[PDB]
């Protein structure tokens, strides 16, 4: 929609960030350190 | 692109940031 | 031909019927420990 016309990167990548959660888990393990 | 690329880089870097702030806080994990 | 049809049904029905009750009767009860 034109009222929304520009948020380029946000609408470009929403869907990748769900994957990032899986990645976050490891980093959240990294500091905790297994 | 690059403007958009910059926007994407800026838009979701809370992951690492979140952990770093939390790590500094020594909150809970 | 046609006799064979009903025959296969009866035979197949039998095993599968014999089959389920094995689990429907006390299957976990059969094991080294409990």
């Amino acid at each position: 929609p034109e009222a929304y016309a520009i948020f380029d990167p946000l609408v470009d990548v929403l869907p990748v960030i769900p994957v990032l959660f899986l990645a976050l888990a490891f980093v959240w393990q990294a500091a905790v350190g297994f | 692109v690059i403007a958009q690329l910059t926007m994407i880089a800026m838009i979701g870097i809370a992951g690492p940031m979140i952990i770093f702030l939390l790590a500094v806080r020594r909150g809970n994990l | 031909m046609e006799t064979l049809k009903i025959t296969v049904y009866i035979v197949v029905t039998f095993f599968v019927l014999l089959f389920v009750f094995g689990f429907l009767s006390g299957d976990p009860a059969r094991n080294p420990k409990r």
Partner: protein
């Protein structure tokens, strides 16, 4: 009671061959598959793939070495329809259209599944951690993929694997023609999965044979010294550890057998799953990426990278098939 006693006999472990409740399906179906197989393999009327022209004799009685002999799959005329005996008009009609194929693979598959469980329901009754049935899924994945699934993508069992040593070779090559499976990534992992299986199978086989606490004389066989039920460790880890630990850097040697053997069984399995996924990805006509005209000059001429050669060879085959 008869039942309560009978039920106790099926489950019973004293049998020389354990038949669990899955065995109640497994045994009759496979025993029915083999009987209707070996016969059909030996004497098959010249099953016809296309009612138009060409009967194919894959039977053993007609001039076929084991190599060339195979059970022809069902025709295209029959399509994918469930085609049992009685539904077919005449017995010879049921053979001429490739019945025995559609008969074997059903009893085989439905036999293969129940087998996958029969390994389980024994393991549960010997009091042991039951993951074998996971490991066995890898072939069974491939079975369903090439036999049951892939023809659904083609809507006819004709394109299913003709089961036989030449039939299989015919299958791949033709399969290579259409879907370009080599360039597909999932297969390209499956190779790694198989080799690294065979590879590790050599090393983990070698390193432990290399290190043997010696209970044997030089003249006597080296094996016989192992006494079934030794509670000694038959092979030094400390000796073999540093070996591979010196051969390459000491960091990667996998100190822990329980850590090793799992990784020993993860690599081949996971390698195979991707293939049975790689096929199902093909059956739906989602193919291996074939990079073509990846190179071009400024003059529009085709620099013709290697993949085109393959792209041509496949393009060669498909015309041949029809």
């Amino acid at each position: 009671n008869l039942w309560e006693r009978f039920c106790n006999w099926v489950t019973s472990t004293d049998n020389r061959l354990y038949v669990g409740w899955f065995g109640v399906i497994m045994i009759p179906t496979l025993l029915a598959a083999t009987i209707c197989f070996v016969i059909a393999f030996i004497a098959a009327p010249p099953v016809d793939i296309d009612g138009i022209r060409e009967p194919v004799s894959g039977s053993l009685l007609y001039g076929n070495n084991i190599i060339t002999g195979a059970v022809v799959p069902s025709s295209n005329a029959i399509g994918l329809h469930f085609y049992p005996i009685w539904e077919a008009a005449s017995l010879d009609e049921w053979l001429y259209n490739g019945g025995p194929y559609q008969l074997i693979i059903f009893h085989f598959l439905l036999g293969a599944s129940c087998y996958m469980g029969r390994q389980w329901e024994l393991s549960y009754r010997l009091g042991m951690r039951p993951w074998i049935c996971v490991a066995y899924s890898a072939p069974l994945a491939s079975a369903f993929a090439v036999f049951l699934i892939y023809p659904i993508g083609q809507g006819s069992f004709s394109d299913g694997m003709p089961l036989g040593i030449s039939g299989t070779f015919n299958f791949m090559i033709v399969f290579q023609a259409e879907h370009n499976i080599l360039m597909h990534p999932f297969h390209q992992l499956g190779v790694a999965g198989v080799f690294g299986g065979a590879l590790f199978c050599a090393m983990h086989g070698s390193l432990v044979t290399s290190s043997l606490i010696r209970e044997t004389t030089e003249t006597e066989s080296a094996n016989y010294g192992y006494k079934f039920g030794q509670e000694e460790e038959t092979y030094n880890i400390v000796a073999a550890h540093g070996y591979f630990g010196r051969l390459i850097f000491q960091y990667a040697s996998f100190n822990n057998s329980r850590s090793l053997h799992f990784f020993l069984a993860a690599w081949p399995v996971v390698g195979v799953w991707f293939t049975a996924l790689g096929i199902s990805t093909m059956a739906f006509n989602l193919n291996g990426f074939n990079f073509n005209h990846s190179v071009i000059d400024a003059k529009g001429n085709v620099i013709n990278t290697w993949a085109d050669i393959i792209n041509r060879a496949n393009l060669g085959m498909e015309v041949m098939h029809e």
